[PDB]
């Protein structure tokens, strides 16, 4: 019906035909040929009305991101962020319906941010990553896509702040999977001692010395020992040295109160 009325240059009959055909919700081949029809006719106000209806017929990001590929092709900045504001609110407004996946919402947040980076407003690029991670703490892809934005456009202390978290989650998930890989402990502790000094920093050192029997194992405890020792220390030292010591207790009594704690740790 269309290409005959295209051939007759009856532009008002293909438009009336497409309005009916897109009312019966047929699929994405019809709408994409209907937005390509108005580009031919230069009706820019009409094709913007279609994408208002096209996102309501096919709610999915490749229809929303097609509409921002339309607007960024024309460079109208006032219209593009209006579509960007409508796209990210509808994900928030319709969160409970569960129709956009975690990988799917990450494409919207990243394409919003990388457009704001090209519009020289880095403070809007940066703040939306915080609202999206808080608004969705579940999806790791939006958190990980937050990092690549800081890598490209952020100042170096901000990257190191965020880098320390992704390394924290990835060291945590290997050690929960792999039982005794003692070389990842000696970095995971030093991940927290370097950049995560806090109650967690002490706590993991408990959680490590929980996991600590190998020759490969016990020197990790030596690390936790001095990590504790650099900062009780005798009390945990006696609990670990209980592995078995008659000569040790005779060595302990002669040089514990007589000489130090460092002498006490020498027995261990």
């Amino acid at each position: 019906y269309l290409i005959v009325e295209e051939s007759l240059n009856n532009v008002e009959i293909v438009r009336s035909l497409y309005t009916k055909w897109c009312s019966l919700e047929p699929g994405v081949n019809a709408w994409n040929s209907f937005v390509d029809f108005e580009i031919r006719q230069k009706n820019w106000n009409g094709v913007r009305e279609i994408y208002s209806k096209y996102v309501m017929a096919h709610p999915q990001m490749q229809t929303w991101l097609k509409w921002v590929r339309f607007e960024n092709r024309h460079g109208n900045t006032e219209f593009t962020r209006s579509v960007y504001s409508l796209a990210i609110d509808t994900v928030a407004n319709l969160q409970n319906l569960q129709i956009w996946s975690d990988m799917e919402v990450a494409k919207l947040v990243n394409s919003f941010a990388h457009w704001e980076a090209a519009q020289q407003e880095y403070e809007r690029s940066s703040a939306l990553y915080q609202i999206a991670i808080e608004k969705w703490p579940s999806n790791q892809l939006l958190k990980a896509g937050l990092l690549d934005f800081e890598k490209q456009f952020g100042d170096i202390n901000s990257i190191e702040e965020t880098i320390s978290y992704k390394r924290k989650m990835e060291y945590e998930t290997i050690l929960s999977n792999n039982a005794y890989d003692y070389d990842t402990w000696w970095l995971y502790l030093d991940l927290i001692s370097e950049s995560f000094p806090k109650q967690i920093m002490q706590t993991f050192e408990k959680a490590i010395v929980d996991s600590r029997k190998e020759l490969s194992k016990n020197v990790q405890w030596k690390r936790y020992i001095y990590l504790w020792m650099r900062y009780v220390e005798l009390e945990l030292e006696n609990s670990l040295l209980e592995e078995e010591f008659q000569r040790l207790i005779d060595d302990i009594i002669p040089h514990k109160h007589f000489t130090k704690i460092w002498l006490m740790y020498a027995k261990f």
Partner: protein, 306 residues
């Protein structure tokens, strides 16, 4: 441009060439309407697209900037916006993307040159990213101004190393750069499982062999696990490597000679292996002759099968 650069100043050479490079409002529509236009739309409007115009414009800027620029100067602010406009126009070739990152590192803008590698790798296809990841990972570990944390350098490898072996490239160097730097900043032999992954990706024999030398320095308990995993033409070479490991630290080696000869055709190199294992001793030419006897009998059995 070239006649005016000699007769008049380079500022005059910029100004006649600035008029070429106005990026008006929208390059996507103008590029497409020019390509779809059947010779009617002039190329006066889509003159910004031309790479040749940009490179020799930039090469005037990068030659005119002083050796110490330090971002206070107008020209270093001018050549950086002219370089960043090429990346935003997306017409940047990978040798030109190196020339800008090199440009920032000479003028002490090192921590912004890591942004330069970061922006462009996404845009390029692999087999070209491998040459940018060498220059990016090397500045991270070798250049003196780059003060990046050891968990940040390890991010730059295992973001690349996972991404770049996913599309499928040999990646012999990146494994070694993640292997070499681990002693200079961290200083433990986690190197093996970092380099085992080179041997077992999903050349490779030349990554597996040099490192199984390295743990014989440290400790024999993590050598012998590799000797087992090393054997699981190329298969025959792996068997030879296992025999060498046995010599460093003999019955397991001879039985391995059998396992390798039974791995595959010819097997004379394996005979050289067992002969090497026999020669290594400072006991009786009896087990050796028995060995050659067993190998000869196996060859006779193969002839019977044929």
């Amino acid at each position: 441009a070239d006649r005016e650069l000699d007769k008049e100043g380079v500022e005059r050479a910029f100004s006649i060439l600035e008029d070429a490079l106005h990026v008006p409002t929208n390059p996507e529509i103008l590029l497409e309407k020019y390509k779809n236009g059947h010779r009617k739309i002039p190329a006066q409007t889509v003159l910004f697209n031309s790479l040749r115009i940009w490179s020799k414009y930039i090469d005037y800027l990068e030659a005119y900037c002083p050796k110490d620029a330090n971002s206070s100067d107008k020209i270093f602010n001018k050549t950086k916006m002219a370089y960043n406009t090429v990346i935003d126009l997306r017409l940047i070739t990978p040798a030109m993307a190196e020339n800008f990152a090199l440009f920032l590192q000479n003028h002490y803008e090192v921590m912004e040159s890591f942004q330069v590698y970061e922006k462009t790798i996404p845009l390029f296809p692999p087999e070209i990213q491998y040459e940018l990841w060498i220059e990016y990972l090397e500045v991270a570990t070798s250049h003196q101004l780059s003060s990046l944390s050891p968990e940040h350098i390890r991010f730059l490898f295992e973001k690349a190393l996972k991404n770049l072996c996913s599309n499928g490239i040999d990646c012999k160097t990146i494994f070694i750069a993640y292997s070499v730097f681990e002693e200079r900043i961290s200083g433990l032999i986690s190197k093996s499982i970092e380099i085992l992954r080179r041997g077992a990706v999903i050349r490779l024999q030349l990554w597996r062999m040099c490192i199984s030398k390295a743990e014989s320095t440290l400790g024999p308990s993590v050598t012998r696990e590799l000797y087992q995993e090393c054997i699981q033409k190329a298969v025959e070479f792996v068997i030879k490597f296992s025999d060498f490991e046995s010599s460093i630290g003999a019955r397991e080696i001879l039985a391995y000679g059998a396992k390798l000869l039974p791995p595959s055709n010819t097997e004379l190199w394996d005979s050289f292996e067992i002969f090497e294992l026999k020669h290594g001793d400072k006991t009786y030419k009896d087990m050796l002759k028995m060995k050659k006897v067993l190998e000869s009998n196996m060859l006779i059995d193969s002839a019977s099968v044929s």
